[PDB]
């Protein structure tokens, strides 16, 4: 499904995500925007041969399995099909241990080449 | 940090031909780093890399058996051999690097490019 910005916004609340490691629910929102336009079943092919899953664009390379990636670590211990769905339970499990590493949300491309230093909470706006 | 590809070039099918990418600003030596190419009318397709202080090396189907990756440390130069060409191997080849790893994306930062053609 593709989410609307304030459902995604509620979802992402009731999954804990607001303030987590100090970031604010907007990052989160605006993050989902411009990796995957809302859009839970998004998947890109990427540079390096890893894949990139589901409404965070959780890559293959790190942190899913999807069986066909050089160097694959897999440090979410899960596979990236089940990232495919509409509910987000597992992608808000697995951007926790990815923003708890050194590179908090710098981790996710777009959200800091559009999205760090914005006016995130702008995302959030006028959702109840 | 920059990265900066030569020499493509016509080629005849069945002929070899190295690739050299010059990097410089950052710690060449263990840096996870690739080839990625872009034929006439398709995206960017992943072609090789290497990563980490082990070399350890890895390659796209298509090319397995026909390229190799290779760093000279010395000069920190990053180079792609490449034998048995085919008319399909033709595209703008770029040598590619994370710019934050571990990160999405796959490698984000790459070259200006250069063009091996193959007939």
């Known amino acids: 499904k593709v989410f609307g910005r304030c459902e995604l916004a509620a979802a992402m609340k009731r999954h804990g995500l607001d303030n987590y490691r100090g970031y604010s629910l907007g990052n989160w929102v605006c993050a989902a925007k411009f990796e995957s336009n809302f859009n839970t079943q998004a998947t890109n092919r990427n540079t390096d041969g890893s894949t990139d899953y589901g409404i965070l664009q959780i890559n293959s390379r790190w942190w899913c399995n999807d069986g066909r990636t050089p160097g694959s670590r897999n440090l979410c211990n899960i596979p990236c099909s089940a990232l495919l769905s509409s509910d987000i339970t597992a992608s808000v499990n697995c951007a926790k241990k990815i923003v708890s590493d050194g590179n908090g949300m710098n981790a996710w491309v777009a959200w800091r080449n559009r999205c760090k230093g914005t006016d995130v909470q702008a995302w959030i706006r006028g959702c109840r | 940090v920059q990265l900066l590809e030569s020499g493509g070039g016509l080629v005849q099918p069945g002929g070899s031909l190295r690739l050299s990418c010059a990097a410089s600003?950052?710690?060449?030596?263990?840096?996870?780093m690739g080839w990625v190419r872009q034929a006439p009318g398709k995206g960017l397709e992943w072609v090789s890399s290497?990563?980490?202080?082990?070399?350890?090396?890895y390659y796209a189907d298509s090319v397995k058996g026909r390229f190799t990756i290779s760093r000279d440390n010395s000069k920190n130069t990053l180079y792609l051999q490449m034998n048995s060409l085919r008319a399909e191997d033709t595209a703008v080849y770029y040598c590619?690097?994370?710019?934050?790893?571990?990160?999405?994306?796959?490698?984000?930062?790459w070259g200006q490019g250069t063009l091996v053609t193959v007939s």
């Open positions: 590619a690097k994370y710019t934050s790893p571990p990160q999405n994306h796959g490698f984000d930062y």
């Open positions: 600003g950052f710690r060449f030596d263990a840096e996870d």
């Open positions: 290497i990563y980490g202080p082990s070399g350890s090396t």
